[PDB]
């Protein structure tokens, strides 16, 4: 009914118009490598 001129949102190999960033590199809470000890804590390798 029409070929209306409009925006073709890019689906090609668009490598460099967008920039996925990271500044102040990773900051969040996750401490799941804890192990059991009393005063000298017996932790292992694990978690993050």
């Amino acid at each position: 009914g029409v070929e209306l001129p409009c925006t073709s949102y890019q689906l090609t190999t668009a490598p460099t118009d967008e920039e996925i960033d990271m500044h102040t590199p990773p900051d969040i809470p996750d401490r799941t490598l804890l192990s059991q000890t009393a005063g000298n804590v017996k932790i292992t390798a694990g978690g993050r």
């Epitope: 192990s35 059991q36 000890t37 009393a38 005063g39 000298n40 017996k42």
Partner: nanobody, 117 residues
Framework: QIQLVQSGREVKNPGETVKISCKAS????????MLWVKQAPGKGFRWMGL????????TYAEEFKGRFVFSLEISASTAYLQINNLTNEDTATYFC??????????WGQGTTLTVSS
């Protein structure tokens, strides 16, 4: 040295509380695990919980934590486990542990108390 010095024996009042005082010193009150211990009349040293003591928390178990409720001012190793809300089917031994490598690394003396008001 790991001196989880408990209270002595007991004839514990039904409906009341009895605070077996775990002076858990040299082992962990103020830095290390105070392992809270209910004591079975058959069951032996049963779980009232445990706590690594660098921050200052005691932790509870399923069968001994509950009616036995314990508090802990760990600076002198001070704490007290109340065999409390007493019934005739509530009495047993009691104990603690002074931990390291999350099983206990030293053993505390405990006290045996039979629930009878």
């Amino acid at each position: 040295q790991i001196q989880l010095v408990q209270s002595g024996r007991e004839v514990k009042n039904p409906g009341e509380t009895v605070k077996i005082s775990c002076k858990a010193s040299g082992y962990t009150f103020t830095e290390y695990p105070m392992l809270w211990v209910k004591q079975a009349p058959g069951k032996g040293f049963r779980w009232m919980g445990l706590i690594y003591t660098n921050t200052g928390e005691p932790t509870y178990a399923e069968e001994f934590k509950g009616r036995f409720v314990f508090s802990l001012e760990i600076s002198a190793s001070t704490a007290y486990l109340q065999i409390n809300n007493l019934t005739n089917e509530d009495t047993a031994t009691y104990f603690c542990v002074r931990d390291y490598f999350i099983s206990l690394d030293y053993w505390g003396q405990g006290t045996t108390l039979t629930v009878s008001s």
